């Protein structure tokens, strides 16, 4: 029920001969499983935690720079030298400045010049790094059981990611993950700034141009390459004086374009990412499903709701006896010839009389009945479906492009059921995923959209060469309008 | 400097939006517009420079693009 | 069992600071907005504001914006509420309330059985 | 604020609706209507939220309904002990709450 | 000499006051008070609603957030008529004086 | 142009072109920013709120 | 931002020495470089693709030259 | 759609497009209208005064 | 029943309360303490001075 | 203007008649006759133009009439 309300619902049909399906989860979406004869659940990755976080380096983004020196020398004697040239506190650099009987020096010409000033720095940014050993993923475990901590809490760790939930009626469902696959975090860092933190590729991360220090520095004077944050000047070729470079933190906030935002104020909280888990149903069971019929009167609470998904949500309740009973739902039609819909809430059960129950249910296109209980007292309901069966045909497969786009080779292990046709796909996509990954990495999507014109064109213009190449361009179009950066 | 080396396209992006997605989306096309509409000389020069070089339309409208994607 | 501790009852000049504490037992504190109701005797109810322990971040009504500040304290599992420049309308009895947040930590958008436990009353006279 | 009538009385074994009316932000726009029992002496207690639905350990004898910009509460069968202050809340749109003006129940001897 | 400022463009900013209000679906967009202000910055975007956001209706809802925009450290753009220019030139002769 | 200490002479078509919240000099209150969005931004990591 | 539209080359360049002179002539030739040596595939996919296009010699490098410069600019 | 004393079914899109001053239903400042230029002209003459 | 309030559309207007100010040329955009509130209708011409 | 966008004719009409069915219905076709009357030498020269784009005689006489449709739409 917790999965009512969210446009990034997805489901997944049907169980193997082990009762087991691929699932994958990601950060703000979640999933539903149902099967012909198990309970149907709601499965959703809501946090993401690392509780050992290494400081890799820090880098600095405002300085400041005190006792500032300068050495000069006379034309043909080389260039100045000064003891805190050494002393790589200081940056310093070498200019030429006119020299003559006017600046106190017997010979005209070039002369040499030294200008070196401590560097300080006020504040910082840090990059931490976590071991993939170190990181607790959590899941929600919550039953379509129509109740108004409603789900079970799991953890799951890169070193026992084998685990089970014991649901109350429900008996146990087993889920084993594989986060080892999921995100690579030995090629990742967490950047933390002032009260902000970003999730950014470590290579990236490393060639930063600002002045850092090693991960372990404490007393802050190890900065290497202080150039890219502090300038020289020869106006006039007669003086050298160095300035600070202003802050770069909004600099910095402009470089972390594509870069996602997570949280490290009260913890290493990250809500992004996927996770594709491995589900196990042997020992589900449904409460109550030998009770028999509620042959006593409904009255609906909460009338008809439409989804983002074309599924229907009813709040009803019961006032006859017999309770616990079993609930009479059907989605039938107007002259009660064919069944026309499917139950996403399995086997509506009614634990108190009192109690009102949620019910789920997926209307065909068109006109749609609702069928409650039975004579005398049944109620029959009068919503329409708007859409068409090529309509969600269609949406279904620009989700599922877009989620293969998204997901890389791990999608087509989102409702895996072991087969080899889904082996072999994923397979060639991984392949062809990691020369993508070789070709385009570190490119903009508007550059992607001019390549893809660039070998549709190719394709167009020169026969399975021609073909070959204009479903590249036209997969590479896709992922450029797809992608957000 | 560090505006210049923007952490995009590195394969990282998931479904959750990201940082500058919606405004960094588009901030290119504008400054690219926004150059080419105060600097008309120098796209008048590349348009005559992809007529002269290329032999086909197509080419001559690429080393267009290209020039005038390049220059801001 | 969840149980809402409340200080007792308290005497202040007007214009003087009180803080006033409701600890609360046997659930996850940091999981759970906490709410501060008054309510003056004899008359309505009137909401503050509320404190999240999830983060500890504030926000109060358009009334009592520049007068009501309260913090929380996740080592006791209690939440202080401090009023200052009391007044001789201030006089009431003051409840705490809880309720659940989101599972994100967050409490944005309130769930529907809100104010799902009630403390016993602190009761404020302002001379 | 909201408006709802200040005292409310009936006889015992009957049925009576109590309403309460606020604005388009707070009840005729959201679901957020609660209502809460306040003992004379004693903490306020919740006896009915999301008015679709009651909460868990109280009697099916309260009933609440939203039409339009009212909200109304219905008892089944008063009772002695249903003398009480009843306080109706919402939480408006601006993600603040209101309450309504307290309303006493009477019920004749 | 005298010169005229123009525009100043900000640095520091700081934001508070941020407020947000729960849009359902089809009821249109949200609406707030610090929106007549102009010092709130405020735009418009789409969020789920449902019953557990306790709305009739499940749907895309409206929502606005608005933050007053205080700036704190600014730069300033000032233009000089070329009327008040001031050139200053030395002139020295070879008189061979040390 | 002026900043906190330094200052630069620069031209003055590409500084009114500066994509920066502003105010024309004449103002005195200092406070109605234009184009503050360039300087602020809205995120929105699960549709849930901005 | 301010930083993608630097006052570079609009006329105003005098005798004294400008505020970025010296390495503010580089940062182009160090980030793309880096950039180069960083994401050889898609400098590969440009050869291809100016072999391609091009027809004669001067035209394949111009058109290589052009897509290696935007890669690093265009993100 | 009401008028003082009148009223009308239309089409939600049409009514969307109708360039009017708006405030959003659920507002109740009462001030906050939005394309108020619809409903104003600003009349310069002989470029002396607006 | 309870019908929902989509958009109000206002139909009559009065303008009160109108003022102006000019800046010399080249110095920017005359300004107001008075824009920063959205109430009020503003429009920005050009004019000889 | 709004009347120059009416709610007209997108499909919601039903039994009962239209706000401004009976002596709402020819509008247009009247003012375009009397705009016809006060402007004729248009309407002259765009019989000359259907003329003589015009290839064959349907052609000139739709771009004619609906020229002269279109004529009084702007003003
Ligand atoms: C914003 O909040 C601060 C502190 O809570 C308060 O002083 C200020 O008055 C608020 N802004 C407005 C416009 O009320
Ligand atoms: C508009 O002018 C009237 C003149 O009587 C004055 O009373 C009113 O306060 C003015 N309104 C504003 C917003 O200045």
Not at chain 1, 360 to 386: C, R
Request: glycine letters at 10%; a neutral charge; aromatic letters at 10%.
């Amino acid at each position: 029920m917790r999965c009512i309300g969210i446009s990034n619902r997805d489901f997944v049909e049907g169980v193997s001969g082990g009762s087991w399906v691929d699932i994958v989860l990601e950060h703000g979406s979640c999933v539903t499983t149902m099967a012909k004869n198990k309970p149907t659940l709601d499965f959703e990755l809501i946090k993401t935690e690392a509780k050992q976080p290494a400081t890799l380096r820090k880098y600095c983004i405002e300085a400041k720079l005190t006792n500032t020196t300068t050495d000069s020398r006379c034309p043909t004697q080389g260039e100045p030298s000064l003891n805190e040239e050494q002393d790589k506190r200081f940056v310093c650099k070498h200019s030429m400045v006119d020299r003559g009987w006017g600046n106190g020096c017997g010979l005209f010409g070039k002369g040499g010049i030294v200008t070196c000033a401590m560097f300080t720095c006020k504040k910082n940014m840090k990059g931490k790094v976590v071991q993939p050993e170190n990181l607790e993923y959590t899941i929600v475990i919550t039953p379509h059981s129509g109740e108004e901590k409603h789900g079970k809490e799991i953890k799951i760790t890169p070193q026992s990611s084998i685990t089970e939930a014991e649901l109350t009626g429900y008996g146990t469902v087993t889920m084993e993950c594989s986060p080892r696959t999921g995100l690579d975090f030995n090629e990742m860092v967490l950047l933390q700034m002032e009260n902000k933190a970003w999730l950014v590729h470590r290579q990236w991360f490393l060639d930063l141009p600002l002045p850092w220090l090693p991960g372990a520095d404490t007393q802050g004077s190890n900065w290497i390459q202080k150039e890219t944050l502090v300038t020289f000047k020869n106006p006039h070729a007669k003086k050298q004086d160095v300035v600070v470079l202003g802050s770069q933190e909004g600099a910095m906030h402009t470089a972390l374009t594509g870069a996602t935002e997570i949280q490290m104020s009260s913890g290493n909280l990250l809500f992004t990412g996927h996770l594709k888990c491995r589900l196990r149903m042997d020992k589900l069971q449904l409460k109550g499903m030998s009770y028999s019929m509620c042959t006593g009167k409904f009255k609906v609470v909460k009338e008809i709701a439409e989804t983002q998904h074309g599924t229907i949500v009813i709040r009803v309740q019961y006032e006859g006896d017999g309770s616990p009973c079993k609930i009479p739902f059907e989605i039938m039609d107007l002259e009660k010839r064919h069944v026309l819909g499917r139950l996403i809430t399995v086997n509506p059960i009614v634990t108190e009389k009192d109690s009102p129950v949620n019910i789920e249910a997926e209307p065909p296109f068109g006109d749609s009945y609702i069928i409650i209980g039975v004579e005398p007292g049944q109620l029959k309901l009068n919503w329409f479906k708007k859409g068409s069966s090529i309509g969600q045909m269609i949406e279904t497969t620009m989700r599922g492009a877009k989620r293969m786009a998204i997901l890389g080779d791990t999608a087509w292990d989102f409702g895996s059921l072991g087969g080899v046709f889904t082996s072999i796909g994923k397979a060639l996509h991984q392949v062809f995923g990691a020369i993508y990954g070789a070709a385009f990495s570190g490119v903009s999507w508007t550059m992607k959209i001019l390549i893809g014109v660039i070998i549709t064109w190719i394709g167009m213009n020169s026969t399975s060469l021609s073909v070959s190449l204009v479903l590249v361009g036209v997969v590479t179009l896709y992922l450029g309008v797809m992608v957000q950066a | 400097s560090v505006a210049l080396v923007p952490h995009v396209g590195m394969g990282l992006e998931t479904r959750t939006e990201t940082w500058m997605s919606s405004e960094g989306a588009w901030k290119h096309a504008q400054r690219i517009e926004t150059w080419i509409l105060r600097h008309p000389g120098f796209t008048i020069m590349a348009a005559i420079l992809a007529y002269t070089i290329g032999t086909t339309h197509f080419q001559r409208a690429l080393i267009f693009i290209l020039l005038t994607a390049v220059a801001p | 069992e969840v149980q809402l501790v409340e200080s007792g009852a308290e005497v202040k000049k007007p214009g003087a600071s009180v803080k006033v504490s409701c600890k609360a037992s046997g659930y996850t504190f940091t999981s759970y907005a906490m709410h501060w109701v008054r309510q003056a005797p004899g008359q309505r109810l009137e909401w503050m504001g509320w404190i999240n322990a999830g983060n500890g971040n504030t926000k109060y009504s358009q009334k009592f914006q520049d007068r009501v500040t309260i913090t929380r304290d996740t080592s006791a599992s209690t939440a202080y509420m401090e009023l200052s420049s009391l007044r001789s309308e201030d006089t009431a009895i003051y409840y705490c309330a809880r309720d659940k947040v989101d599972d994100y930590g967050d409490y944005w958008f309130p769930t529907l059985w809100y104010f799902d436990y009630w403390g016993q009353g602190t009761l404020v006279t302002v001379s | 604020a909201l408006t709802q009538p200040a005292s409310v009385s009936g006889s015992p074994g009957q049925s009576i609706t109590i309403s309460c009316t606020g604005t388009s932000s707070d009840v005729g726009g959201f679901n957020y209507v609660s209502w809460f029992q306040q003992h004379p002496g004693k903490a306020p207690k919740l006896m009915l939220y999301d008015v679709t639905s009651r909460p868990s350990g109280v009697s099916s004898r309260f009933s609440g309904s939203k039409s339009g910009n009212t909200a109304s509460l219905t008892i089944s069968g008063l009772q002695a002990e249903d003398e009480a202050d009843y306080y109706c809340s919402s939480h408006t749109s601006r993600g603040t709450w209101v309450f309504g003006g307290g309303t006493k129940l009477t019920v004749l001897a």
